[PDB]
Every structure is written in structure tokens, then in C-alpha cells.
Amino acid sequence: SFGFTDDGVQSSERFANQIIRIEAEETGDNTSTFEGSLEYVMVNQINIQDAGTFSGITPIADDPSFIVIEDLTDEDAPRVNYNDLGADGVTTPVSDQEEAPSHSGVVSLNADSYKIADTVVITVEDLDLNVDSDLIDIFTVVSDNSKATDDAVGSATTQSLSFGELGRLLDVTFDDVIWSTPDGANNTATGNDSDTCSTELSNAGITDTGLGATGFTLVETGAATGVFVGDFQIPSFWCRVSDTTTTPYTYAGDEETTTGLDIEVNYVDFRDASGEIVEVGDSAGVRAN
Amino acid sequence: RGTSASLDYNETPQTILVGFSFASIDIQPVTDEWTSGQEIPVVIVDADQNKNSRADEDLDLNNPDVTLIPALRTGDPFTIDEGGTPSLIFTNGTNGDDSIFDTGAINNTSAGQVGNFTLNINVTRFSSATNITSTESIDTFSKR
Known part of the structure; x- marks a missing residue:
């Protein structure tokens, strides 16, 4: 069984029940040494919602994998047990444990000031986001007008919880407002003239309507x-979000220049150094000459 | 861009990542000045045009699957986009007996070059019984 109950904020509210067996292999012909491996996947806000991540592990193998729901140190560190028949003839187990810490993530922006049509590069240093050692790990932006996680890096599958929205991992904002494309049912505002913000952007040749x-x-x-x-x-140019409390968002009726507005990136760490939810960010200024 | 696939042999998977490459173009003059009647090289480096690692590839105008071609322009040529995005239709039929295509000739005479253009169309057994209509697009610099 895998999951959390309520918010999942308190430790007593997170659970993971599993048993893992290592089928180690003899190194040589007459070498009594038997070799195996372990690997674990630390859970994040995205994979926790998918049954794929829990069914993905291999419980019985020479190289098993297991799930970690939170930081495991001291008495709770994962331990492998091996029952043994000793040279004195009595059965005495032998065991080893290794801690599985969580890491505090940082997010950064390569420059302090950008100009129009400048490349902006975003990096996230969170070791807990590596879920596979063989494959490159990729996170993609959500395009679903019926979900609160729209135009953000995360998952269309989502839930409303205390800390915020469970399907949201990263997003980009101009003037502390989500940078989103004017699409959906609430994009009918024309502003000063009779042109809606979506066609207003299109006449300016802009295809980068949102993240x-x-x-x-x-x-x-x-x-x-x-x-x-x-x-x-x-x-x-960009189209401001008038109201974020509705799904889909309600967009303004007139495009605005990006010059003189700050740009920010926000990352939500599902597991910080203690295994708690925190949000971190970076900022920079868009300039003109 | 950024999405991937995964291929596995011997229980070791490998990602197949999709990405784009920045290009660089540079004219390379052989000596200090480019004078009349001298060939100098032009070199382009773009990994997006290397679509086969086991073959050498040419930027042929005529191939639609080469997306970009270098171009040089001087003064005001009259390219096919001079009036904006054109409109093109293909057709089956036959030239009229009065058509310039059947009566004209290239002999520097108004009798040969100048005429009118008449045709008879049979697109009744064509798909949806209409002349083949097209979607048009124009290259920014190559004008294709």
C-alpha cells in the first residue's frame, strides 16, 4: 500500500508498506561472495499522484528498488536483514542500514537583468528529483484549461490541499502574475477597443503567448x-491574468509590454532537508533602452 | 523539443532526446580583401540539417525537406512573394487553339511573345470534383 491521508503534511499521515527481497549472485565459482544492488525513488508532488510510480518498482530481483515516502534516518533508515547459521551452530542474523536523506532544492536564473528577446535559462538543483539512474529525467508544462495547474510545470492530475495545489512544481510570472496564454472560456474581454487580448497578441506576430x-x-x-x-x-507583449480564483483564468482585454516588469520563477520542494513542503524562488528585471 | 524516448538492451536503458542546435555562418576571405573573380568559402554549421549520421547531405532548393537555405540579395529583385503570399491551383485539361501556349514562339516578335491564355478544364473525376488547391508558405530569405 502507498499514499498519504488528508494534507499529508504531518509524518503520521504518510504511509508506505512493502517488502523487498534481494536475489544476490555468486561473484565466482568458488568465491562465497554474493553481489546485489539497491536503489530507491524519493516521491515528489508529481509522481505521488500516479499509480505508475508505485507499480514501476521491482520488488524481487538481483537489483530491487523500493519507495521512500519521506526522509529516513537514524532508527528509520532502510535496513537489509540476513538470517544466518553461525560456525558455533546457532542462528544469528546479520544486518546493515543506510540513511536515505532528502535535499533542499534551489532554483536560480542565469542573469540579474534581461532585455527583450533574450534567452533566459532556468536551473533547479534538487537531488531528490532524480528518480532513475539510467534515463534522463524530464518535467513538462501543463496545457489543460479545466485544471488549476494551467501553463505551469507539473501534472494535469491535481488536488486542492493546505500548502497549495498538489500538481504544481514550477511556474514563471511577470509582475507576480502567472504568465499564461489567453485561451479557454474567460478570454472574451476586449478592453478599451473591440479586440480580445488573444487576437491582440496575434496581430503583433507573438507566438510566445505563455510558458x-x-x-x-x-x-x-x-x-x-x-x-x-x-x-x-x-x-x-503579454496578456495579464485579471482573476486567478476561477478555472479557466479570466484574462484582461489589452496586451501590455514586458519592459519595466520583474520576472520570477517559483519552485515547490515536496521534500526539503527535513521532508516538509517549502517554496523557493529567484527574480530578475526586464529592461529596455 | 525536450521530450524523449527510451530504448533498452541488456537491462540498461538509453534516452533518445530531441533538441535543436544554434547555427553559425561565416564568409572566409582567403586574403585581406575579396576582389573580383575570386572564390572564397562560405561555411554553415547547423546540426539540425545533419539528419543522417551515415550520409553526407546537400541543401538542395528542390527538396522540400531541407527547411533552410542561405541566400544573398542585392537591390530589388521581383521574387514570387512580391505581392504577399501567392495563391496556386493545379489543373487537368487542354490548350485552346487560340492559346499563346499553342500559337506563340520565342522569336522577339509581338506575334510570338504576346497573346492571350485560354484553356478547357476536365477535373470532374478529380477528388471532390475541384481543381487541386494548395496551402502556400514563403521562406523569409530563400523566397521559395
Whole structure:
């Protein structure tokens, strides 16, 4: 069994019940040494909602894997037990344990000031986001007008909880407002003139209408590096979100220049150094000449 | 861009990552000045045009699957986009007996070059019984 109850904020509210068997292999012909491996996947806000991550582990193998719901140290550190028949003839087990810490994530922006049509590069240093050592780990932006996690890096599957929205891992904002494309049912405002904000952007030749339309993705630099990098290009115009409390969002009726507005990136760590939810961010200024 | 696939042999998977590459173009003059009647190299480096690692590839105008071609322009040529995005239709039929395509000739005479254009169309057994209509697009610099 795997999951959490209520918010899942308190430790007593998170659970993971599993048994793992190691089928170790003899190194040589007459070498009494038997070799095996372990690996674990630390749970994040995205994979916790998918039954795929829990069914993905291999419980019985020479190289098993197991799930970690939170930081496991001291008495709770994962331990492997081996029952043994000793040279004195009595059965005495032998065991080893290793701690499985969680890591505090940082997010950064490569420059302190950007200009229009400058490449902006986002990096996230969270070791806990590496879930496979063989494959590059990738996170993608959500495009679903019926969910609260729209135009953000995360999952369309989502829930409303105390700490915020469970399907949201990263997003980008101009002037502390989500940078989203004017689409859906609440984009009918025309503003001063009779032109809606969506066609208003199109007449300016802008295709980077929001974060979801630049093709921005977080890509791990190596197979097991734990560092994720994405990039996109600053647009000349953008369409402000009037009200964020409705789904879909309600968009303004007039486009606005990005010049003189700050740009920010927000990352939500499902597991910090203690195994608790925290949000971290970075900022920079868009300039003009 | 950024999405991937996964191929596995010998219980070791490998990602197949999709990405784009920045290009670099540079004219390389052989000596200090480029004078009349001298060939100098032009070199382009773009990994996005290397679509086969086991073959050498040419930037042919005529191939639609080569997406970009270098171009040089001077003064005001009259390219096919001079009036904006064109409109093109293909057709089956036969030239009229008065058509310039059947009566004209290239002999520097108004009698040969100048005429009118008449045709008879039979697209009745064509798909949806209409002349083949097209979606048009124009390259920014190559004008194709």
C-alpha cells in the first residue's frame, strides 16, 4: 500500500508498506561472495499522484528498488536483514542500514537583468528529483484549461490541499502574475477597443503567448546528475491574468509590454532537508533602452 | 523539443532526446580583401540539417525537406512573394487553339511573345470534383 491521508503534511499521515527481497549472485565459482544492488525513488508532488510510480518498482530481483515516502534516518533508515547459521551452530542474523536523506532544492536564473528577446535559462538543483539512474529525467508544462495547474510545470492530475495545489512544481510570472496564454472560456474581454487580448497578441506576430507555448521543459543534464535546466525567450507583449480564483483564468482585454516588469520563477520542494513542503524562488528585471 | 524516448538492451536503458542546435555562418576571405573573380568559402554549421549520421547531405532548393537555405540579395529583385503570399491551383485539361501556349514562339516578335491564355478544364473525376488547391508558405530569405 502507498499514499498519504488528508494534507499529508504531518509524518503520521504518510504511509508506505512493502517488502523487498534481494536475489544476490555468486561473484565466482568458488568465491562465497554474493553481489546485489539497491536503489530507491524519493516521491515528489508529481509522481505521488500516479499509480505508475508505485507499480514501476521491482520488488524481487538481483537489483530491487523500493519507495521512500519521506526522509529516513537514524532508527528509520532502510535496513537489509540476513538470517544466518553461525560456525558455533546457532542462528544469528546479520544486518546493515543506510540513511536515505532528502535535499533542499534551489532554483536560480542565469542573469540579474534581461532585455527583450533574450534567452533566459532556468536551473533547479534538487537531488531528490532524480528518480532513475539510467534515463534522463524530464518535467513538462501543463496545457489543460479545466485544471488549476494551467501553463505551469507539473501534472494535469491535481488536488486542492493546505500548502497549495498538489500538481504544481514550477511556474514563471511577470509582475507576480502567472504568465499564461489567453485561451479557454474567460478570454472574451476586449478592453478599451473591440479586440480580445488573444487576437491582440496575434496581430503583433507573438507566438510566445505563455510558458506552455514556448515548449519550455525541465531536462536533467545527466542520467543521475540531479540538475535540471530549461530555457525560453522573453516576449515583447503579454496578456495579464485579471482573476486567478476561477478555472479557466479570466484574462484582461489589452496586451501590455514586458519592459519595466520583474520576472520570477517559483519552485515547490515536496521534500526539503527535513521532508516538509517549502517554496523557493529567484527574480530578475526586464529592461529596455 | 525536450521530450524523449527510451530504448533498452541488456537491462540498461538509453534516452533518445530531441533538441535543436544554434547555427553559425561565416564568409572566409582567403586574403585581406575579396576582389573580383575570386572564390572564397562560405561555411554553415547547423546540426539540425545533419539528419543522417551515415550520409553526407546537400541543401538542395528542390527538396522540400531541407527547411533552410542561405541566400544573398542585392537591390530589388521581383521574387514570387512580391505581392504577399501567392495563391496556386493545379489543373487537368487542354490548350485552346487560340492559346499563346499553342500559337506563340520565342522569336522577339509581338506575334510570338504576346497573346492571350485560354484553356478547357476536365477535373470532374478529380477528388471532390475541384481543381487541386494548395496551402502556400514563403521562406523569409530563400523566397521559395
